[PDB]
Design a protein around this ligand. Structure first.
Ligand SMILES: COCC[NH+]1CCN(c2ccc(Oc3cc(C[N@H+]4CC[C@H](CNC(C)=O)CC4)cc(-c4cc(Cl)cc(Cl)c4)n3)cn2)CC1
Ligand SMILES: *[C@@H]1O[C@H](CO)[C@@H](O)[C@H](O)[C@H]1NC(C)=O
Ligand SMILES: [Ca+2]
Ligand SMILES: [Ca+2]
Ligand SMILES: [Ca+2]
Ligand SMILES: [Cl-]
Ligand code: NA
Ligand code: NA
Ligand code: NA
Ligand code: NA
Length: 472
């Protein structure tokens, strides 16, 4: 195998590293996987389709302009170069290799397109038409943004966009399901807590956080239980950043944030899909859980879950490992159909006050076709009132003892509107048996005499009843 000759490939440290601080992408290339036949679309501010490092892989069938309602996602050029982000992300996935220009994409033989959707008012219809673009042609969608990362917003897909997620994972990709890759957020300095973002908090999105070059949690990172894994991105000014294509046929060395991590993951998922085109949307999440690597990622919350895997709210299961992903994909056995076990927990509303604990022992739908012995995602769908929402912290403990943070205190969130059937999601109990005692903890982290009431707690379990591996 001959590594790329592109002039900035040596600067793509998160691919070309020889120090083991990389995504292990060369190992996938050397197994023969480069993204050939796979189609990825960047949901963002447009894509410079004539960029010298994108044109050779550009796919009009992976593109649309939902801001101006036409097929051409070319960015709107401005003095401040506002609409450059989709072009940066596109090159992360699929910049052309061995052509003397900039660097390379993770999946440098994949086809790449973009939906111009963020350069205008982002409505529910705009979101739905983007998520649902050409779902039997596009395999993988990459989205780096969501509701405001101000540390005080709770929002997610409205009805059309949520319908687009369900249609995508159910009928998309010939019934195997669209793969939606999401950035978990850039709200770290606002103390944002990313289960409050219903896009990354969705089970239908494969959610990705960031690590700095020296292996630390970047200033912009949001911790939450819905995240599944990590790719490298930017950090402090002694740490390198992401190197990729830029607007006006240029090359940047200063692409940053969790919004630069999701495209790298989308590229790795493209290599993995080339290795096994029959993988379902759930299969892909299983592969990420099983192959991602905690080693040398620094966090104070690494915890071993009930099946022996280390998990962090900053990093999920750790750094994506492209060589391991493509190796495990090749002989992967499709998972069983998804079961869903609904458990209404409360027998009466509960005052929250300073602290509330709710304990319930469940059988996880024993005796039913939705019996789950092998968990995937779990949700605590909560309806509660509180006088100042950001003073709340919420934890969920599984029968195996895994403590998922559902919500951390958000100092800027002054809302008195509480949570209205908000489906807080955790990935940290993946492959555990969910039968037994679950514990929900709601705590007032402030010294103020805050008040409110929990009126509904639905525990929703997803998973199967077959196929488990020996614990790690
Ligand atoms: C270098 O940085 C470049 C600068 N760039 C500027 C533009 N930008 C940006 C602009 C707007 C933005 O707003 C948003 C805001 C949302 C949240 N939703 C919630 C539902 C709401 C409609 N409720 C109802 C009841 O009907 C409409 C807004 C979602 C997304 C979103 C959705 C999808 Cl499916 C894919 C992607 Cl990608 C984003 N997007 C997020 N980001 C990102 C930064
Ligand atoms: C894809 O997986 C399904 C489910 O196991 C199987 O029935 C089908 O034969 C597979 N298709 C290919 C082309 O391998
Ligand atoms: Ca256009
Ligand atoms: Ca190149
Ligand atoms: Ca956020
Ligand atoms: Cl469902
Ligand atoms: Na965000
Ligand atoms: Na997700
Ligand atoms: Na444990
Ligand atoms: Na149990």
């Amino acid at each position: 195998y001959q590594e790329p000759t592109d002039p900035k490939f040596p600067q793509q440290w998160y691919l070309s590293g020889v120090t083991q601080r990389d995504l292990n992408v060369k190992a996938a290339w050397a197994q023969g996987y480069t993204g050939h036949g796979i189609v990825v679309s960047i949901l963002d501010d447009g894509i410079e389709k004539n960029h010298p490092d994108l044109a050779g892989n550009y796919d009009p069938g992976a593109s649309f302009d939902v801001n101006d309602q036409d097929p051409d996602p070319q960015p709107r050029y401005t003095q401040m170069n506002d609409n450059r982000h989709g072009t940066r992300c596109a090159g992360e996935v699929a910049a052309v290799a061995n052509n003397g220009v900039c660097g390379v994409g993770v999946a440098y033989n994949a086809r790449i397109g973009g939906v111009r959707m963020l350069d205008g008012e982002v409505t529910d219809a705009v979101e739905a038409r983007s998520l649902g673009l050409n779902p039997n042609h596009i395999h993988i969608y990459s989205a780096s943004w969501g509701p405001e990362d101000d540390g005080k917003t709770v929002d997610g897909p409205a009805r059309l966009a949520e319908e687009a997620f369900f249609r995508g994972v159910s009928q998309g990709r010939g019934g195997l399901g669209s793969i939606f890759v999401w950035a978990s957020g850039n709200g770290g300095r606002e103390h944002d807590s990313c289960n409050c973002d219903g896009y990354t908090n969705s089970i239908y999105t494969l959610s990705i956080s960031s690590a700095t070059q020296f292996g630390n949690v970047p200033w912009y990172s949001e911790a939450c239980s819905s995240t599944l894994a990590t790719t490298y991105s930017s950090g402090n000014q002694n740490e390198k950043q992401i190197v990729t294509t830029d607007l006006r046929q240029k090359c940047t060395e200063s692409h940053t944030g969790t919004s630069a991590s999701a495209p790298l993951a989308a590229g790795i998922i493209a290599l993995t899909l080339e290795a096994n085109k029959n993988l379902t949307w759930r299969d892909m999440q299983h592969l990420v859980v099983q192959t991602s690597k905690p080693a040398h990622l620094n966090a104070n919350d690494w915890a071993t879950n009930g099946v022996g895997r280390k998990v962090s709210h900053s990093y999920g299961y750790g750094l994506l490992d492209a060589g391991a992903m493509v190796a495990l994909a090749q002989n992967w056995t499709t998972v069983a159909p998804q079961r869903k076990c609904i458990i209404d927990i409360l027998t009466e509303p509960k005052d929250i006050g300073k602290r509330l604990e709710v304990r319930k022992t469940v059988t996880a739908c024993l005796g039913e076709p939705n019996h789950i012995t092998r968990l995937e995602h779990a949700q605590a769908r909560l309806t509660l009132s509180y006088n100042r929402r950001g003073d709340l912290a919420i934890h969920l403990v599984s029968p195996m003892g895994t403590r998922s943070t559902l919500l951390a205190a958000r100092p800027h969130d002054y809302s008195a509107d509480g949570f209205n059937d908000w489906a807080f999601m955790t990935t940290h109990s993946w492959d555990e048996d969910p039968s037994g005692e679950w514990v929900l903890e709601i705590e007032n982290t402030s010294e103020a005499n805050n008040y409110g009431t929990l009126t509904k707690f639905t525990l929703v379990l997803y998973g199967t009843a077959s196929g488990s591996l020996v614990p790690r």
